[PDB]
Design a protein around this ligand. Structure first.
Ligand SMILES: [Mg+2]
Ligand SMILES: [Mg+2]
Ligand SMILES: [Mg+2]
Ligand SMILES: [Mg+2]
Ligand SMILES: [Mg+2]
Ligand SMILES: [Mg+2]
Ligand SMILES: [Mg+2]
Ligand SMILES: [Mg+2]
Ligand SMILES: [Mg+2]
Ligand SMILES: [Mg+2]
Ligand SMILES: [Mg+2]
Ligand SMILES: [Mg+2]
Ligand SMILES: [Mg+2]
Ligand SMILES: [Mg+2]
Ligand SMILES: [Mg+2]
Ligand SMILES: [Mg+2]
Ligand SMILES: [Mg+2]
Ligand SMILES: [Mg+2]
Ligand SMILES: [Mg+2]
Ligand SMILES: [Mg+2]
Ligand SMILES: [Mg+2]
Ligand SMILES: [Mg+2]
Ligand SMILES: [Mg+2]
Ligand SMILES: [Mg+2]
Ligand SMILES: [Mg+2]
Ligand SMILES: [Mg+2]
Ligand SMILES: [Mg+2]
Ligand SMILES: [Mg+2]
Ligand SMILES: [Mg+2]
Ligand SMILES: [Mg+2]
Ligand SMILES: [Mg+2]
Ligand SMILES: [Mg+2]
Ligand SMILES: [Mg+2]
Ligand SMILES: [Mg+2]
Ligand SMILES: [Mg+2]
Ligand SMILES: [Mg+2]
Ligand SMILES: [Mg+2]
Ligand SMILES: [Mg+2]
Ligand SMILES: [Mg+2]
Ligand SMILES: [Mg+2]
Ligand SMILES: [Mg+2]
Ligand SMILES: [Mg+2]
Ligand SMILES: [Mg+2]
Ligand SMILES: [Mg+2]
Ligand SMILES: [Mg+2]
Ligand SMILES: [Mg+2]
Ligand SMILES: [Mg+2]
Ligand SMILES: [Mg+2]
Ligand SMILES: [Mg+2]
Ligand SMILES: [Mg+2]
Ligand SMILES: [Mg+2]
Ligand SMILES: [Mg+2]
Ligand SMILES: [Mg+2]
Ligand SMILES: [Mg+2]
Ligand SMILES: [Mg+2]
Ligand SMILES: [Mg+2]
Ligand SMILES: [Mg+2]
Ligand SMILES: [Mg+2]
Ligand SMILES: [Mg+2]
Ligand SMILES: [Mg+2]
Ligand SMILES: [Mg+2]
Ligand SMILES: [Mg+2]
Ligand SMILES: [Mg+2]
Ligand SMILES: [Mg+2]
Ligand SMILES: [Mg+2]
Ligand SMILES: [Mg+2]
Ligand SMILES: [Mg+2]
Ligand SMILES: [Mg+2]
Ligand SMILES: [Mg+2]
Ligand SMILES: [Mg+2]
Ligand SMILES: [Mg+2]
Ligand SMILES: [Mg+2]
Ligand SMILES: [Mg+2]
Ligand SMILES: [Mg+2]
Ligand SMILES: [Mg+2]
Ligand SMILES: [Mg+2]
Ligand SMILES: [Mg+2]
Ligand SMILES: [Mg+2]
Ligand SMILES: [Mg+2]
Ligand SMILES: [Mg+2]
Ligand SMILES: [Mg+2]
Ligand SMILES: [Mg+2]
Ligand SMILES: [Zn+2]
Lengths: 60, 208, 206
RNA sequence: AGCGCCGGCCAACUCCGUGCCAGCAGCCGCGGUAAUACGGAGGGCGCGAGCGUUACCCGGAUUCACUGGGCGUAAAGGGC
RNA sequence: UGAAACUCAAAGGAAUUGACGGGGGCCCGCACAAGCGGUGGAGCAUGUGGUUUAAUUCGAAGCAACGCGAAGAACCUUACCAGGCCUUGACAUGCUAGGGAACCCGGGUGAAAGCCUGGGGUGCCCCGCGAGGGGAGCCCUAGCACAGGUGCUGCAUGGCCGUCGUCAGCUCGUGCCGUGAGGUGUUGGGUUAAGUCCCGCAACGAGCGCAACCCCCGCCGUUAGUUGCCAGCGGUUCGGCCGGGCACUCUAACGGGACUGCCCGCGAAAGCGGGAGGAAGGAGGGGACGACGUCUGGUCAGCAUGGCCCUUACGGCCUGGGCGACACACGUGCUACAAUGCCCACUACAAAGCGAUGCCACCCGGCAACGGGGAGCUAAUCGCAAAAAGGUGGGCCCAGUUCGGAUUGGGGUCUGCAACCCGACCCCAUGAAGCCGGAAUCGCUAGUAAUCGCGGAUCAGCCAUGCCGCGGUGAAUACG
RNA sequence: AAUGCUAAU
RNA sequence: GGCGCGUUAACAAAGCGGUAUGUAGCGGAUUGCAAAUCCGUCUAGUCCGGUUCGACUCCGGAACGCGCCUCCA
């Protein structure tokens, strides 16, 4: 139950509380960041490839 | 109810004997007799290898506890003079007793007391104990042969069922029945295998 | 888990971002999704052209997109017959104005993605793996690079047990930040599974 | 026109079936769900009115060493 | 003196590289010791084993599984269960045929999905004032190629990660030694945090690691001065509010500064000890960064992927339930057991963050949660925002207490279609265990431990006492 | 002063 | 048959008219794991009938088990 779940989440529900976020890259439903729309795994992958503008490794 | 138990330090059993009480217990457990084979990575294994082990299951019908009594119609009693000291008493008294179990020819002689009555009673008691011992010995021999015919040597061959954990597979080789619910089977869900075995037993009597 | 991504480690020091634009909290994710869509579409379009790098650049409702390929003619074609077409669909895939630029790579031997892609293509052709790694590393070293490394992981040659084969020459200082190291990755989908190809090329220190 | 063989020794390789079973085996060893080693098929190699197998003898075996071996620690200096 | 039957496919000698030793030597680490505070006992939160259940989805297993995947389980999530439903399917291309759809508001039954349903409209290119017919964005019915599968295999795999271990190592080219495996280099002496450096040497050099290059903190300088700040000046409704200024603090870019650089001593040297100066002294403090390899390590349930398996069902939709069970066992935490304390009132002092179906000033009503008006702020401008420990004053007076706040009864607020299973918060009443914890066990060497509060991700709401960060107050001890 | 670790890389 | 004795929990085995122990078993600690060790905890009087305020305990019976005697012929 992966493709159907992704499409159903992409669909409008009868109630507004039944809408939940999913990762726009791999379809994950857990740990999805609002700022990027991506899950933590995809976020790390894309950040290591320089494809996230202004995003850099943090160290202080 | 569990009758006998010999546990091991790691939580296994080297032997465990229990009772299933209920109408049709033996009829429904009679297909579990034989050698069961498991292929898996042991928890006692250090290098992570797969091992093939076996366990033997013996199923017997619970017997009866009929008491033993001597039928006097097949027993002959002789009385005669004893041997040894005693003077005119032992010369003239029929104190010595012999009891003979006619079907088998086994005889017991008693001369311990001066009294014929006590000697007769003692001889009958000894004869009863001897016949009871022989009956028990023959019963035990028959049961031992049945057990051996069921479990054999426990070798890896001659197995009756295989539980493959890496493949999550259960195979009954008597009927070629393979299923893939290993956890369910190990949790007590033996109905499909047993119904297949009963199917095979009913189909094997297709005569003519 | 052992090694950090060579490019991600040096972002803003030696390497530069592949996408360069500014967006606020309201527009970042939609533009990012559009960028991923564009890159995914172009990846399966110019594969035979030798696609190394795709750069997305946005000013105001207009996106640049500059691609770097081994053979620009494979992207442009006869009088641009393909160059226009790949642009038009892109607009129909973005709903904006696009300025697709084509750039030639001076040395295909010095671009780690191209080396990795070539090695993966050879592996897919049921070629020998060890010979391929040796030949690719030697080719890179023949073009003035100060060092090179190529690593292949998987069921090398269809074997039932996965292995890793690597070759190296020169210098590959992965712990040096001033070192300009180009990293490339490629996948080989053979009938027996997927093999991973990694390429490191060292081009001196800035 | 047939017989043996096709893991190494040793010449001649792929597919399917099975799953420490069935089986193979001169030695080393194969087979426990992706077997060039089991069975079948396609192909191949060697011989061919034959082709294999068993038994026995010599060779390889300088492994009873005359040609042509050894004995500190590998088997081997006798207690003197 | 001295066999055989039988049995095995080897038994052996020397040397090599490792590993190991309750062998040796020299070293090291909160390893011990020296200290301070905990855990193991109580109650509660949470994860797990087990057991139970229709289901209590699945994975993670010594260290390196157990506030772990899960940075948000009422529905959704959801992968499990029960029932009601659908069939080329909720998603993708293609071949047809019949309609020609395309897009939009209504009817019955139903818990909903669904089933049966009632009223209009396709551009574009056409013969064209024609009935109309043709190719076309696009849709449905009946067929197919097929889609779909969180179904199995991490003992077929990629990618990523954990671990030995931020440990000081692991190797290579040529030369030389050895029949050979291999050795040398890389061993010996001194030194270092370091295979760090120096000296010696059949070796001479090199690579991956160490270090450095990057970020934050600590001192200063240049560029600037708004929404920042206010030393001097003039106003002032007493707030930098204004004029004005960039002095200062600060903000963020660029630079300098520290390098055993100097002096004394020790030593071949590397270096070690002492001192001056300096904000900073011997790596200045903290991050980022993890070698060849190891662990048949983890992940097919994030994704991808070989093989196997299902195909009006192992696919898909809805409602309801379960993941929240409960004789017990364990791990990680929170709150305490009190006077170096608790309660009440007034009164100070931060940092880093977040905010447009948002943050919400202020005023009104309710004890309150909160509700009703309603500015300012797309935010160095406005808000969250009150910091708390602290300081001052008062009350409690050694008690199961004005300690402690579990459990339960009742009245309410808010979010959400919907708080029964199963949310959070306010008020009233109730006021449990607990008097410092057995064998045992854990963290920590300085702005550290301890202690106090604040923010953020996920997120309608929240079961967060978790996690990632931030600052306030601030120890003890290290002989060895 | 302190015993042991079967059997498929 | 006569005389004498005994029956306790998981096993072996004691005192007591009113109140064990050793080794096990079970929960925890330690250990990579098992054993060993350590901290806690724990299951009863053969049966029936009496006396007694009160019976595992004193008395009577029954069952089973054990020991010795059973001679002059
Ligand atoms: Mg399903
Ligand atoms: Mg939500
Ligand atoms: Mg989500
Ligand atoms: Mg006589
Ligand atoms: Mg006499
Ligand atoms: Mg007589
Ligand atoms: Mg007489
Ligand atoms: Mg050959
Ligand atoms: Mg064979
Ligand atoms: Mg054969
Ligand atoms: Mg096969
Ligand atoms: Mg053969
Ligand atoms: Mg064959
Ligand atoms: Mg010859
Ligand atoms: Mg020979
Ligand atoms: Mg000879
Ligand atoms: Mg010869
Ligand atoms: Mg001779
Ligand atoms: Mg010889
Ligand atoms: Mg000798
Ligand atoms: Mg010799
Ligand atoms: Mg010897
Ligand atoms: Mg010999
Ligand atoms: Mg000898
Ligand atoms: Mg001699
Ligand atoms: Mg001798
Ligand atoms: Mg002598
Ligand atoms: Mg022999
Ligand atoms: Mg200590
Ligand atoms: Mg405690
Ligand atoms: Mg406890
Ligand atoms: Mg506790
Ligand atoms: Mg679980
Ligand atoms: Mg799984
Ligand atoms: Mg842990
Ligand atoms: Mg934790
Ligand atoms: Mg939670
Ligand atoms: Mg549902
Ligand atoms: Mg649910
Ligand atoms: Mg693995
Ligand atoms: Mg892996
Ligand atoms: Mg090491
Ligand atoms: Mg060499
Ligand atoms: Mg030599
Ligand atoms: Mg070394
Ligand atoms: Mg060496
Ligand atoms: Mg180090
Ligand atoms: Mg070095
Ligand atoms: Mg470093
Ligand atoms: Mg200035
Ligand atoms: Mg494993
Ligand atoms: Mg696993
Ligand atoms: Mg998968
Ligand atoms: Mg798979
Ligand atoms: Mg849960
Ligand atoms: Mg509950
Ligand atoms: Mg834990
Ligand atoms: Mg605790
Ligand atoms: Mg608490
Ligand atoms: Mg109180
Ligand atoms: Mg609820
Ligand atoms: Mg109490
Ligand atoms: Mg008290
Ligand atoms: Mg402990
Ligand atoms: Mg330390
Ligand atoms: Mg907690
Ligand atoms: Mg031992
Ligand atoms: Mg041992
Ligand atoms: Mg033993
Ligand atoms: Mg030992
Ligand atoms: Mg072992
Ligand atoms: Mg052993
Ligand atoms: Mg062993
Ligand atoms: Mg007893
Ligand atoms: Mg007692
Ligand atoms: Mg006791
Ligand atoms: Mg005990
Ligand atoms: Mg115990
Ligand atoms: Mg142990
Ligand atoms: Mg134990
Ligand atoms: Mg114990
Ligand atoms: Mg007499
Ligand atoms: Zn994702």
């Amino acid at each position: 139950a992966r493709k159907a779940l992704i499409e159903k989440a992409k669909r409008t529900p009868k109630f507004k509380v039944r809408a939940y976020t999913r990762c726009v890259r791999c379809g994950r439903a857990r740990s999805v960041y609002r700022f990027f729309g991506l899950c933590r795994i995809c976020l790390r992958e894309l950040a290591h490839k320089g494809q996230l503008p202004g995003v850099r490794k943090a160290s202080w | 109810e569990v009758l006998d138990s010999h546990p091991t330090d790691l939580g296994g059993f080297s032997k465990v004997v229990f009772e299933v009480r209920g109408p049709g217990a033996y009829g429904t457990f009679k297909y579990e007799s034989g050698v069961h084979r498991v292929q898996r990575v042991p928890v006692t294994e250090t290098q992570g290898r797969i091992h093939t082990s076996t366990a033997t299951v013996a199923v017997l019908p619970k017997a009866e506890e009929e008491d033993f009594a001597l039928n006097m119609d097949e027993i002959r009693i002789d009385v005669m003079r004893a041997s040894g000291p005693g003077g005119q008493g032992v010369n003239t008294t029929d104190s010595a007793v012999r009891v003979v179990h006619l079907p088998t020819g086994i005889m017991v002689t008693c001369q311990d007391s001066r009294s014929q009555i006590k000697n007769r009673e003692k001889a009958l008691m000894i004869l009863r104990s001897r016949l009871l011992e022989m009956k028990r010995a023959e019963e035990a021999e028959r049961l031992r042969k049945t057990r051996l015919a069921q479990i054999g040597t426990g070798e890896r061959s001659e197995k009756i069922r295989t539980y493959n954990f890496p493949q999550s597979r259960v195979t009954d080789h008597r009927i070629g029945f393979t299923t893939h619910d290993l956890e369910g089977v190990l949790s007590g869900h033996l109905t499909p295998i047993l119904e297949a075995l009963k199917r095979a037993d009913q189909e094997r009597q297709l005569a003519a | 888990g052992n090694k950090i991504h060579p490019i991600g480690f040096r972002l803003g020091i030696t390497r530069d971002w592949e996408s360069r634009w500014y967006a606020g909290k309201k527009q970042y994710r939609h533009l990012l999704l559009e960028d991923q869509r564009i890159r995914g579409l172009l990846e399966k379009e110019l594969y035979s052209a030798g696609l190394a790098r795709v750069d997305i650049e946005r000013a105001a409702d207009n996106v640049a997109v500059t691609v770097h390929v081994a053979k620009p003619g494979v992207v442009i074609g006869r009088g641009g017959e393909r160059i226009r077409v790949l642009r038009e669909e892109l607009a129909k895939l973005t709903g904006k104005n696009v300025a697709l630029n084509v750039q030639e790579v001076q040395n295909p031997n010095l671009s780690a993605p191209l080396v990795a892609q070539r090695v993966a293509e050879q592996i897919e052709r049921r070629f020998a793996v060890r010979r391929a790694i040796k030949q690719a590393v030697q080719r890179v070293m023949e073009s003035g690079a100060k060092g090179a490394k190529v690593i292949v992981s998987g069921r090398i040659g269809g074997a039932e047990q996965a292995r890793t084969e690597w070759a190296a020459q020169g210098r590959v200082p992965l712990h040096t930040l001033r070192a300009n190291i180009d990293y490339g990755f490629a996948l080989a989908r053979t009938t027996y599974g997927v093999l991973g190809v990694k390429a490191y090329i060292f081009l001196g220190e800035v």
